[PDB]
A paper describes a structure:
To counteract the mutational effects of deamination damages, a unique alternative excision repair pathway has evolved, in which the enzyme endonuclease V (EndoV) plays an important role. EcEndoV primarily incises deoxyinosine (dI) in DNA19 at the second phosphodiester bond 3′ to the lesion, producing a nick with a 3′-hydroxyl and a 5′-phosphoryl group. In addition, EcEndoV also cleaves the U, O, X, apurinic/apyrimidinic (AP) site, insertion/deletion mismatches (IDM), flaps, loops and pseudo-Y DNA structures, when Mn2+ is supplied as a metal cofactor. EcEndoV is the first member discovered in the EndoV family and it has a broad substrate spectrum.
To investigate the substrate recognition and catalytic mechanism of EcEndoV, we solved the crystal structure of apo EcEndoV. In order to obtain diffraction-quality crystals, the 9-residue, C-terminal fragment was truncated. The resultant construct is prone to aggregation, but still retains the deoxyinosine-specific endonuclease activity (data not shown). This construct contains residues M1-A214 (named EcEndoV-SF) and it forms plate crystals in a condition containing PEG 3350. The crystals belong to an orthorhombic system with the space group P212121, and each asymmetric unit contains two monomers. Both chains are almost completely intact with no internal disorders and of good electron density: chain A is visible from M1-V208 and chain B is visible from M1-S210. The enzyme displays the ‘RNase H-like motif’. Two of the most important elements for substrates binding and recognition are the PYIP motif consisting of residues P72, Y73, I74 and P75, and the hypoxanthine-binding pocket comprising hydrophobic residues Y73, P75, and L78 and V115 (corresponding to I122 in TmEndoV). Additionally, four conserved glycines G76, G104, G106 and G114 also participate in the formation of the rigid pocket and their backbone atoms are involved in hypoxanthine recognition. No Mg2+ is found at the cleavage site. The r.m.s. deviation is 1.4 Å over 204 Cα atoms between EcEndoV-SF and apo TmEndoV.
Residue numbers in the entry: 1 to 208
Write the structure that this text describes.
Amino acid sequence: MDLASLRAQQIELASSVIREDRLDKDPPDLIAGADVGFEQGGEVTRAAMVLLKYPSLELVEYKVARIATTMPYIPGFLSFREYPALLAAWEMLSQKPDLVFVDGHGISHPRRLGVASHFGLLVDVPTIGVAKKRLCGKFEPLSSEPGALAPLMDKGEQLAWVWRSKARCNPLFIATGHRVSVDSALAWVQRCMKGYRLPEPTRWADAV
């Protein structure tokens, strides 16, 4: 069972996610944005990484990796196909960021191991999940103003902050990836806003 040991790996990694602040460099000098997806109906995994300066939020570099998908889609295990592409893009970076924002779920994931937690943990860098849609859990519907804020709850636990970053946009689901608390994850995303729906690092990562 490659399937039973996949599952085993998963619950171990979910266990090892750090849910408290552990930045080695606060404030960061350099942050990064990350995006992953699939091309060729799943045969190629593509990941984009972006480096910005903090606090300016200036683009200084970006890199795209494309690799062949080696694992097929298996429900619950998307982070294992996504992870290798993010790793490849990461290793193209000419310097390493102090904090990483991933376009995707942190612990706010059925298995507590969204791609942002998966990546953050294997690479061991402070990481935040900035997701565009709910995956699991529940929240009190948000009022329509910018700054509307509700906790995302599952099983008695807060997995994320649901935060309307911008008027007339759908909200963000901001969760710890690795080595960032849920409340600091929100704080850091808010610090990395300019005038769009997404914070700059993942906006940039999607744009390249």
